[PDB]
Design a protein around this ligand. Structure first.
Ligand SMILES: CCCCCCCC/C=C\CCCCCCCC(=O)OC(CO)CO
Length: 136
């Protein structure tokens, strides 16, 4: 029973964020800033209802969803694309498929210990992020 992802989580590693961004066609001036930033993830979860915020000094991104309920996602101030998104549980891993113009786009997010793991995929690029839970 590790489905409870509530908390504030601070990034400690970010592997291949460059390649993921390039796969999304982010221009190199934007990538040059974005690759350097420490991200924070704030998750407010009530059962299968999620409200999430990913924040940095450069850009913030909010996405809210209910597990199992397809929704329209506009990735505003990221790559600015429209996708149909569905989040499901695979065991205690939260799995998102983002169907749209990019093939094999989505993410997977799960807890181990005091860490939150997030693997972002686009095409043949995978970015692996790890966040540490912030205290009180
Ligand atoms: C926002 C902080 C970084 C902003 C700088 C990046 C700008 C360059 C363009 C694209 C990179 C998109 C990468 C972030 C993916 C969104 C996070 C996300 O959807 O996470 C899920 C799972 O946590 C939310 O529930």
């Amino acid at each position: 029973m590790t489905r409870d992802q509530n908390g504030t989580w601070e990034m400690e590693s970010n592997e291949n964020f460059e390649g993921y961004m390039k796969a999304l066609d982010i221009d190199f001036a934007t990538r040059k800033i974005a690759v350097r930033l420490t991200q924070t993830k704030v998750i407010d979860q009530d059962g299968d209802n999620f409200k999430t915020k990913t924040t940095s000094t450069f850009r913030n991104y909010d996405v809210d969803f209910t597990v199992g309920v397809e929704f329209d996602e506009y990735t505003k101030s990221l790559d600015n694309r429209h996708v149909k998104a569905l989040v499901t549980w695979e065991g205690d891993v939260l799995v998102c498929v983002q169907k749209g113009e990019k093939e094999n786009r989505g993410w997977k997010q799960w807890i181990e210990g005091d860490k939150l793991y997030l693997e972002l995929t686009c095409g043949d690029q995978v970015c692996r992020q790890v966040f540490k839970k912030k205290l009180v």
